[PDB]
């Protein structure tokens, strides 16, 4: 549970685990419902989870770039399908012999296993969602790399035009991630790195642009090197914190 870094995930899994392991009171059927209907609903809910899960995985922007990641996701979804099958079977056994304390216990155990598999899927899903953010950091890093290496003023401007948009995109996702982070120190560290990136990139633009125009100018070289180092540190800091590590 201590590896869970998303509050959205944390609350969902807390619901999953607490509710199914803390059943005390029981209730009659809701109006119009049947024992067979309870199993039918469960069956449909398992199916819909699998369908939505498959769609979500197929749309994941790093589907190409990270094949082992997608493989883990399919594996974890498969564990939901499997425990789901056991739940539907033992659940059916229970509702058909609903006074059997022992069949209730077995069905309850099946439920724990299924909702735990759902929780593990969500935890893995968050880690892949984080990899997507890290991929965006890498994109910013490469564009900045190219900007530093550019040999013409026109290239520096065109690359900074790209960088502006990439950093704006990254800024949105990082701010939202910060709001969702469980640990306030990771939150604060992520926001600090965000701020450093926003301050450093415009300075990298103007230091690189001045240096391509005046290469003989040794303070211009120094300033560009210094701002480049600052840029690299901020990007590394974002990646470090997204991965649950301290920056620097």
């Amino acid at each position: 549970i201590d590896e869970v870094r998303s509050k959205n995930v944390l609350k969902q899994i807390t619901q999953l685990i607490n509710e199914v392991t803390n059943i005390t009171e029981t209730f009659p059927l809701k109006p119009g419902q049947t024992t067979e209907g309870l199993v039918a609903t469960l069956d449909a809910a398992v199916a819909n989870f699998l369908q939505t899960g498959s769609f979500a995985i197929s749309k994941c922007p790093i589907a190409n770039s990270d094949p082992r990641a997608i493989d883990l996701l399919h594996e974890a979804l498969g564990a939901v399908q499997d425990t789901g099958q056991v739940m539907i079977q033992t659940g059916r056994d229970f509702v058909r012999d609903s006074t059997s304390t022992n069949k209730r216990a077995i069905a309850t155990n099946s439920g724990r296993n299924l909702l735990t598999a759902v929780a593990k899927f969500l935890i893995l899903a968050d880690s892949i969602d984080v990899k997507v953010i890290v991929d965006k950091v890498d994109e910013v890093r490469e564009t900045a790399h190219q900007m530093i290496e550019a040999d013409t003023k026109i290239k520096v401007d065109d690359l900074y035009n790209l960088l502006i948009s990439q950093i704006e995109e990254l800024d949105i996702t990082v701010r939202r991630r910060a709001i969702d982070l469980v640990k306030p120190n990771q939150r604060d560290d992520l926001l600090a790195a965000r701020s450093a990136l926003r301050q450093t990139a415009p300075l990298l633009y103007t230091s690189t642009r001045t240096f391509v125009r005046h290469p003989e100018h040794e303070e211009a070289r120094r300033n560009r090197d210094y701002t480049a180092d600052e840029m690299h540190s901020a990007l590394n800091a974002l990646e470090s914190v997204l991965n649950g590590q301290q920056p620097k």
């Binding site: 998303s6 959205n8 995930v9 969902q12 619901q15 999953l16 509710e19 199914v20 059943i23 009171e25 029981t26 209730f27 009659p28 059927l29 809701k30 024992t35 309870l38 199993v39 609903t41 469960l42 449909a44 809910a45 398992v46 819909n48 989870f49 939505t52 899960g53 769609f55 979500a56 995985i57 994941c60 996701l73 739940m87 659940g91 229970f94 509702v95 609903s98 006074t99 209730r104 069905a107 309850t108 439920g111 299924l114 909702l115 759902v118 899927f121 969500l122 899903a125 968050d126 892949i128 969602d129 997507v132």
Partner: peptide, 27 residues
């Protein structure tokens, strides 16, 4: 949107359907 975000509603419904079955009092 993200995978976690997309799975919020189906997680709830699956949770709901499991709890509904397990909290059935019997005959």
């Amino acid at each position: 949107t993200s995978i976690v975000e997309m799975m919020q509603m189906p997680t709830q419904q699956l949770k709901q359907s499991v709890m509904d079955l397990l909290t059935y009092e019997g005959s």
